[PDB]
């Protein structure tokens, strides 16, 4: 027998406030 | 023990609600929610509109705005060059003063 | 590229942390020292030119 483990979700922040402001700032 | 796909999320806690099972329910529900909202957070729904807030629609709008302003600057340089060669050209700012008192703008 | 205003402790940090006041004093004392040493150098050169 083997156990099936579900490991919860750990994430790093992708955007700053829903947006990535580096690219937005370039284009702006 | 074959896989069973886990019917409706609160399936477990409806039989002898415990602390660990309830914590497990909370965890899996919030994980699903987080994943779906992140996918919609940056991309958006299948219909694609430039008046969208997501991330890709905002940057698409910025790119289109930049392209418009670049071609506008091109026409402005065209106007300057054409007026330098003594060919009167119209401008995005108008003619200024026309032939009256205050003379004529739209010279070099 | 370093800016001459980096060394300024504005006015309100120094009354939140009083030691910053004393820090400024130390800086000023150092200046005195430097100038004194500078003068000494000049003086010594002059004496040699005399001798």
């Amino acid at each position: 027998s083997i156990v099936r483990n579900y490991k919860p979700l750990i994430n790093r922040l992708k955007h700053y406030n829903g947006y990535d402001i580096n690219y937005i700032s370039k284009i702006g | 023990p074959p896989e069973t796909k886990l019917p409706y999320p609160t399936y477990w806690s409806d039989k002898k609600a415990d602390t660990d099972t309830l914590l497990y329910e909370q965890i899996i529900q919030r994980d699903k929610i987080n994943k779906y909202s992140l996918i919609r957070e940056t991309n958006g729904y299948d219909p694609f509109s430039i008046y969208g807030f997501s991330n890709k629609e905002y940057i698409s709008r910025l790119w289109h705005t930049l392209k418009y302003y670049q071609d506008l600057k091109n026409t402005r340089m065209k106007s300057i060059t054409s007026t330098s060669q003594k060919i009167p050209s119209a401008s995005i700012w108008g003619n200024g003063y026309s032939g009256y008192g205050n003379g004529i703008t739209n010279t070099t | 590229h370093s800016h001459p205003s980096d060394m300024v402790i504005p006015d309100h940090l120094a009354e939140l942390i009083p030691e910053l006041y004393s820090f400024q004093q130390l800086v000023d004392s150092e200046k005195r020292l430097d100038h004194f040493i500078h003068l000494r150098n000049l003086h010594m050169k002059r004496m040699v030119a005399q001798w």
Partner: protein, 139 residues
């Protein structure tokens, strides 16, 4: 619940473990005398301005943003100073029915208003703690 609050403080997993058959968020939300499921309050969607337009899945799988945020923000602040902060929180094993009767006959929006007041005050208190630690770092 009240014994576990007396023994452990701001460690709500051990409080729930003591309770046996409940989740830490439910223990926090009963400690403040608030419901769950978020629909018994502001189920519409005019006291609450922009909450009308907040999206929600119909007929199934309710999510509670407001109550979850409240239980999270108050779960950080040492239940004793919470009991000192507001009178809504349960304060002793004998004060349960008294306080339940006193909160009775309130408008459904009064519950939201009091919950959010407790939450934002907890956030301000935590920010004060962070301010003192920043002063320490400056020194």
């Amino acid at each position: 619940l009240l014994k576990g609050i007396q023994e452990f403080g701001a460690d709500w997993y051990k409080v729930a473990k003591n309770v046996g058959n409940k989740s830490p968020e439910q223990c926090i939300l009963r400690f403040l005398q608030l419901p769950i499921e978020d629909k018994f309050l502001y189920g519409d969607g005019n006291g609450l301005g922009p909450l009308k337009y907040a999206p929600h899945l119909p007929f199934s799988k309710s999510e509670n943003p407001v109550l979850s945020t409240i239980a999270f923000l108050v779960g950080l602040v040492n239940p004793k100073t919470v009991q000192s902060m507001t009178q809504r929180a349960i304060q002793s094993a004998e004060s349960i029915k008294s306080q339940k009767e006193e909160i009775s006959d309130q408008k459904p929006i009064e519950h939201i208003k009091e919950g959010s007041e407790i939450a934002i005050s907890s956030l301000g208190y935590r920010s004060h703690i962070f301010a003192t630690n920043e002063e320490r770092q400056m020194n």
